């Protein structure tokens, strides 16, 4: 009685992989499917050892391990489109490593993932990431402000936003995060009683002058 | 405002309390005499008046004191509420 025969009438929905620790790994696409699988094992419909996995859970677990043994590595995300050959995106500028060090890192990752045959390490450009973020906001025509730090970039979107703006914003952010992960760019959405949508000015003898950003804001009377 | 509502309510409340006992005894005497006149068939009609006059006067004697204490306390209270503002 194979495990695939127990998961259901739809077959392609799940993917079964053998691992070097002599254990079966079931790859799922989402939470709902993950629980649909986990019920089978925990019920005890299968006799040997098995485990269920997904992209989000493994990203978390790997990050927890990196936090301990490589506490200063700058990286983005691990993609599992082909679960036998993951792709690990590292920053080109923020990391200094030798080729040898990169190889060792690769081997230790392979030791953490007994279901993977090899891990491909790829270097990505931060300017590229930041640019694609800004272009996506301009393309949606959301109002925003950008702030830069030595280790990251923030976009703040705030004010009395309209329903359409909210919808489009939340869709875009959800899309981008899936590609680049949260580790470098943060998007903050905050509603305020402010019709200027975060712009601010001072009136002097020379007329209007644009204020620097900040925490405090003038709640609109209008 | 609420002082006005409170004082006006209390006025009706005091009317009710003071008048209640005489009207009760005049009721009970009216019922008892009316029944008695059916239990023995007698068609008199001043007998209720004769008895209930004595009944009401007696309880006016009894309550003569509490009547004056209640009204004094109320008068002092409302004079304070009217004048003591600051």
């Amino acid at each position: 009685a194979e495990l695939d025969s127990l998961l259901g009438q739809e077959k392609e929905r799940f993917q079964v992989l053998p691992g070097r620790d002599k254990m079966l790994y079931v790859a799922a696409q989402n939470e709902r499917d993950t629980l649909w699988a986990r019920q089978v094992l925990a019920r005890g419909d299968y006799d040997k050892n098995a485990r269920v996995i997904n992209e989000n859970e493994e990203n978390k677990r790997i990050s927890i391990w990196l936090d301990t043994y490589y506490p200063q590595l700058a990286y983005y995300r691990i993609h599992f489109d082909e679960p036998r050959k993951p792709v690990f995106w590292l920053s080109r500028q923020r990391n200094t490593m030798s080729k040898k060090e990169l190889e060792v890192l690769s081997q230790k990752l392979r030791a953490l993932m007994p279901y993977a045959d090899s891990v491909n390490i790829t270097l990505m450009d931060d300017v590229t990431a930041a640019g694609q973020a800004e272009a996506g906001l301009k393309q949606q025509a959301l109002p925003y402000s950008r702030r830069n730090h030595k280790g990251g970039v923030t976009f703040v979107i705030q004010g009395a936003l309209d329903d359409v703006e909210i919808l489009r914003a939340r869709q875009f952010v959800d899309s981008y995060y899936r590609t680049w992960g949260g580790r470098y760019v943060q998007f903050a959405i905050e509603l305020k009683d402010d019709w200027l949508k975060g712009r601010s000015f001072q009136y002097g003898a020379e007329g209007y002058i644009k204020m620097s950003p900040g925490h405090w804001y003038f709640p609109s009377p209008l | 405002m609420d002082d006005l509502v409170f004082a006006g309510n209390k006025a009706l409340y005091l009317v009710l309390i003071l008048s209640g006992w005489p009207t009760i005894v005049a009721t009970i005497i009216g019922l008892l005499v009316g029944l008695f006149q059916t239990v023995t068939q007698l068609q008199e009609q001043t007998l209720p008046f004769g008895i209930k006059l004595l009944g009401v006067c007696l309880c006016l004697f009894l309550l003569s004191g509490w009547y004056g204490e209640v009204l004094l306390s109320y008068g002092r209270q409302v004079i304070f509420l009217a004048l003591a503002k600051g």
């Binding site: - | 509502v5 006006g8 009706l12 009710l16 008048s19 209640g20 005049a26 009721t27 009316g34 059916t38």
Partner: protein, 81 residues
């Protein structure tokens, strides 16, 4: 003016009527009972008791709903010149 007063007084009249017919029906069993003279003893107590419950709305039920207001001047008067 008459209508508003009757609409407002109606709750006390009905209870004072029912209280009297109840004594009338009671008198059928004891025809020497002077139900009229009994009702005179009762009704002033009943009237105050009942008016004491529905007393507090007498504040808002006049302060606004019956007060005249300046927008009404448009309809009660006109210029003939």
């Amino acid at each position: 003016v008459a209508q508003n007063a009757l609409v407002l007084a109606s709750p006390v009249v009905l209870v004072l009527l029912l209280s009297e017919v109840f004594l009338g029906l009671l008198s059928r069993f004891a025809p020497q009972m002077n139900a009229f003279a009994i009702s005179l003893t009762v009704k002033s107590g009943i009237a105050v008791l009942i008016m004491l419950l529905y007393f507090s709305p007498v504040l808002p039920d006049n302060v606004l709903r019956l007060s005249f207001q300046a927008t009404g001047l448009s309809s009660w008067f006109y210029e003939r010149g």
